[PDB]
Amino acid sequence: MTADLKSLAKRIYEAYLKNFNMNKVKARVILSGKASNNPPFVIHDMETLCMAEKTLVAKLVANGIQNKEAEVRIFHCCQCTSVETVTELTEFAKAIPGFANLDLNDQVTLLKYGVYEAIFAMLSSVMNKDGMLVAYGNGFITREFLKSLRKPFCDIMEPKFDFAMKFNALELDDSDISLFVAAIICCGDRPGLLNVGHIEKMQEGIVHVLRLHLQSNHPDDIFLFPKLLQKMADLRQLVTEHAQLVQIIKKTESDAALHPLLQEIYRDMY
Ligand SMILES: *c1ccc([N+](=O)[O-])cc1C(=O)Nc1ccccc1
Ligand SMILES: *c1ccc([N+](=O)[O-])cc1C(=O)Nc1ccccc1
Numbered sequence: 001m002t003a004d005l006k007s008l009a010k011r012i013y014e015a016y017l018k019n020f021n022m023n024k025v026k027a028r029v030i031l032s033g034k035a036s037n038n039p040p041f042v043i044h045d046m047e048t049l050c051m052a053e054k055t056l057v058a059k060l061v062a063n064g065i066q067n068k069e070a071e072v073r074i075f076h077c078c079q080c081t082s083v084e085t086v087t088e089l090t091e092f093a094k095a096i097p098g099f100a101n102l103d104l105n106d107q108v109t110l111l112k113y114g115v116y117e118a119i120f121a122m123l124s125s126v127m128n129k130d131g132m133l134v135a136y137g138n139g140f141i142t143r144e145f146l147k148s149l150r151k152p153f154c155d156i157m158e159p160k161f162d163f164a165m166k167f168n169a170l171e172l173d174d175s176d177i178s179l180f181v182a183a184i185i186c187c188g189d190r191p192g193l194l195n196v197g198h199i200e201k202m203q204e205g206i207v208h209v210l211r212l213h214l215q216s217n218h219p220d221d222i223f224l225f226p227k228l229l230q231k232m233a234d235l236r237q238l239v240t241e242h243a244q245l246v247q248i249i250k251k252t253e254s255d256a257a258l259h260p261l262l263q264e265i266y267r268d269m270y
């Protein structure tokens with residue numbers, strides 16, 4: 001249990017709560033509705049989509065996407081939410097003791113492979129069996145409407161709902177997700193890592209606080225730590241399959257222009 005570790009556990013917790021505006025507590029209260037009778041605007045078909053797109057009429061006109069196919073509009077603003085999460089993650093990583101001290105090539109490498117493995121883990125916080133919160137909790141896209149899209153777009157988010165359902169069953173709080181996300185970033189297994197030895201030292205410190213933190217917060221889930229280690233493996237597989245589907249859609253779809261920042265991350269990944 002010790003004391004210095006508890007401080008580190010909360011440095012990682014105070015960060016995250018500061019960099020990620022949408023956490024599990026806020027999301028879990030919206031989906032519960034036990035704090036407001038003003039539910040979010042549900043998006044379950046093309047009509048509700050075009051309605052919700054009436055608000056964001058400026059972002060679409062200036063971006064030249066107003067008259068694009070429905071699938072290209074969704075996975076284009078949704079692509080904009082990941083560019084924001086990558087920025088927040090880059091700042092959250094600074095709170096990880098030892099990360100700012102590593103070589104820039106290693107920092108860029110760790111974030112290059114860990115951003116999406118964490119985007120999908122945190123994405124589960126705003127997901128249930130029927131949909132996921134969007135627009136900072138103001139909207140709610142249905143899990144079925146995303147499947148109703150034409151392939152391959154309909155095969156993009158369904159795997160995320162699959163992981164989220166099994167992941168959310170572990171019943172973690174932001175205190176646990178923070179350390180978990182920190183462990184994802186500190187992974188000495190990423191390809192091309194220079195000082196592969198030091199990063200392993202930094203990962204052991206985080207993974208150790210995570211094991212002790214889970215043992216202290218979820219005392220009855222003896223094997224919660226092994227379960228999370230398995231989830232880290234599934235996230236790596238989930239990102240691999242996802243990144244492969246972006247390259248496929250990047251050439252076979254002449255109307256879906258990938259974002260520049262995300263274009264560098266997906267380059268020569270898996
Ligand atoms: C993304 C796609 C479509 C819309 N829309 O039809 O309004 C909105 C968004 C979105 O993420 N908006 C947003 C902006 C700023 C902060 C939170 C959410
Ligand atoms: C980001 C947020 C919202 C929208 N939108 O719905 O108009 C678009 C974006 C965005 O980043 N679009 C984009 C795509 C490709 C290259 C640059 C910018």
Ligand SMILES: *c1ccc([N+](=O)[O-])cc1C(=O)Nc1ccccc1
Nearest residue numbers: 052074077078081133134135136139
């Ligand atoms: C896509 C990925 C992540 C989020 N998010 O968690 O804020 C949202 C979206 C998204 O596509 N939102 C959306 C779609 C359509 C209309 C409004 C908002």
Ligand SMILES: CC(C)(Oc1ccc([C@@H]2CC2(Cl)Cl)cc1)C(=O)O
Nearest residue numbers: 075078079080082246249256257258
């Ligand atoms: C997690 C998420 C939403 O996955 C995507 C989805 C769509 C795209 C864009 C449209 C093509 Cl396929 Cl060029 C890139 C990444 C993201 O990275 O923002």
